[PDB]
Amino acid sequence: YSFKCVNSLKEDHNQPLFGVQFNWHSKEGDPLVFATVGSNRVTLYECHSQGEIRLLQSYVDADADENFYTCAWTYDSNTSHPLLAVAGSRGIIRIINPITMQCIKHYVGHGNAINELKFHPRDPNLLLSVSKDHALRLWNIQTDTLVAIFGGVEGHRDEVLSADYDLLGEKIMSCGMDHSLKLWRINSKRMMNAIKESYDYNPNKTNRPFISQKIHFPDFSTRDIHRNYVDCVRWLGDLILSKSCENAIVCWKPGKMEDDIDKIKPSESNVTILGRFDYSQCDIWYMRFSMDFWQKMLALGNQVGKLYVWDLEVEDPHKAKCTTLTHHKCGAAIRQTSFSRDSSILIAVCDDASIWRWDRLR
Amino acid sequence: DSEDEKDPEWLREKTITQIEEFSDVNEGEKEVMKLWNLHVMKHGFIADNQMNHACMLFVENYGQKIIKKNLCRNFMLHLVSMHDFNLISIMSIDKAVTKLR
Amino acid sequence: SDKIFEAISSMFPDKGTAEELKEKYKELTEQQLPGALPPECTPNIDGPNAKSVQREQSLHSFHTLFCRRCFKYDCFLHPFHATPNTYKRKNTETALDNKPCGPQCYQHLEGAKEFAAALT
Amino acid sequence: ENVEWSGAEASMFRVLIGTYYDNFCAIARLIGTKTCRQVYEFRVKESSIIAPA
């Protein structure tokens, strides 16, 4: 439980970055690779020993002005090539193949900026895209068809911000500016019929446009947790985690401690809070936390450049942990944290187009 | 294909749900109200001279169900109410239960 | 009760009212419930629990729910504040013919066949 | 005859009287529990104790 600054870098365009994503699809032993997106550029690096990090590749968009926002690593079932997709303010989604160093797929169906991208833990052709259009879409990146559109008569009213798959990949949570957090399901018969259909469609075959699925109702929701924005949520086994600009992270479960997660009636009107976590100076929004693939530690960026670290272990959240690893160079802000498949290294992005690196000493 | 018609899915859902909010009702009533209002939506009846044909077609579709629901007796109570609102003649109320079997 | 309700309403926008305060006061003072049918339980006809009741309560819900114009229950574009089916109608618009209603005919039995005109 | 007149069927008669006021042959035809004479009979039992129209 000790990371040390073994390297720190800085870009040249000096425009703030947002994204950090190790490729968690490393065949055991392969080098550590990770990427980061900035104003209108992407960056490819590789972790080396002795705090060495090596520039690998970088692309850029010129034909317009955009501030890229998110990324996600996946692969191709067909030939196992690594796959990275990104999206920015323009609201378009691109798909790049580093093996050929080209973009092979682009998607345009939103109406505003995008805010996050994630994949189904099991299926690799299912991309979830969260936007400001109040609508959370979901694509089959392989047959080039939309599937669902969550939002409508009972959706979010203002600029959905963040979402998160359950650990197994059948349940989602969503959070946006309207203090509102709503539950969606995927396991429903209708849903999976739809998905299977999606995996089968030839445009040349029919004169019909594929028929998506519109969903106008959350499985459950409330706004009683915070009295401010909510901009990042994390499934916890069957528990919940969320942050606000109120300088505290909270864990809770819906209903009562006795209430199972999978028996919850849609008209449920109660929630159970368990504990709180604390920190200092997160007085702005759009700042995220991450966790190890082994769900044992917690990382979080900070406004003034600090850090705050806990353990996801039996440490009682009343007095679970407190670990602040700090350096004296930048205190502008830190947007996002990221671990490898193991807990070896931890990266974070400062607000000034500067990178950091922290090598763990257990 | 003109991607537009009178019945939007989300509406059918919303109305049933809203009905279920009510506490002071028996299932032998809510089921009826829903089974009817949905068919109302399905065709868009406006003119009063239609209401006779309306209840006719209604059971003409939902015959098997109300039987399978064993709910015809409250159907008749509804027929009562509707005649009370001056849209049925007695010359058809019975006629419904007749065509029913 | 009153001042405590006001303080709770002030400290909480979720409650924000003494109406819910008196509702919980009544729920805690009595702590009992007649049933899903109203405090005057009106079980259904098509069900087992039957109870002969006058016509009014039998049609009460139906009257207190209908929206005549759109011909629907709970008009989504009509407020329900209105007058019930309590109105006037032609009391004599029938055939009014006496006949053998069958073996157990109401007519064909001079007791009832004459009490009908007597009850007229 | 003192016959099975279910509270369901009996409230049912209570409603059906507000509909014809003079026809046992139809009311009982709907209320399959009673008998048309028994309807006349129950009227002589109950509707004899009814309020004026």
The ranges assigned to domains in chain A are: 1-362
Cβ-defined contact of D18 to C55 (cutoff 8 Å): yes
Size of interface B-D (CB pairs under 8 A): 13
- Indicate the number of domains in chain B: 1
Quick count: other Cβ atoms within 10 Å of Cβ A98?
Answer: 17
| Helix H or strand E segment including B61 | helix B51-69
In a domain, B2, yes or no: no
Max CA-CA distance within chain C? 77
Distance of CA A209 to the CA centre of its chain: 31
How far is the C-alpha of A169 from the C-alpha of A185, rounded, in Å?
A: 10
Cα separation values, C110 from C10, C106, C117, D40, D43, Å: 76, 9, 11, 11, 15
In a domain, B11, yes or no: yes
How far is the C-alpha of C109 from the C-alpha of A298, rounded, in Å?
A: 92
Phi, psi of A297 (to 5 degrees): -135, 165
Residue in D15, D21, D39 nearest the CB of C106: D39
Q: For residue A207, what is the nearest residue in chain B, using CA coordinates?
A: B1
How far is the C-alpha of D31 from the C-alpha of B94, rounded, in Å?
A: 11
Cα separation values, A191 from A39, A213, A215, A340, D13, Å: 37, 8, 10, 33, 50
Indicate if the alpha-carbon torsion angle A360, A46, A99, A354 is positive or negative.
positive
Q: End-to-end distance of chain C based on CA atoms, in angstroms?
A: 59
Cβ-defined contact of C119 to D48 (cutoff 8 Å): yes
Q: Which residues does C32 contact at the CB level (< 8 Å), separation at least 6?
A: none
In a domain, B1, yes or no: no
Structure determined via: cryo-EM
Phi, psi of A93 (to 5 degrees): -120, 125
* Among A269, A273, A180, residue whose Cα is nearest residue A230: A180
Burial of A214 (0-12, 13-18, 19+ CB in 10 A): middle
Domain that holds residue B16: 7-101
* Among A101, A100, A107, residue whose Cα is nearest residue A86: A107
Q: Which residues pair with A276 in a beta bridge?
A: A250
Spell A271-280 as b/e; 16+ CB within 10 A means b.
beeeeebebe
Which of B75, B78, B83, B90 to probe by mutation at the D interface, max D CB count within 10 Å? B90
Phi-psi region for residue C110, left (φ > 0), alpha (ψ -120 to 50) or beta?
Answer: alpha
Q: For residue B12, what is the nearest residue in chain A, using CA coordinates?
A: A216
How far is the C-alpha of C94 from the C-alpha of A75, rounded, in Å?
A: 80
In this complex, is the C-beta atom of A214 within 8 Å of any C-beta atom belonging to chain B? yes
* Among A155, A162, A137, A134, residue whose Cα is nearest residue A147: A137
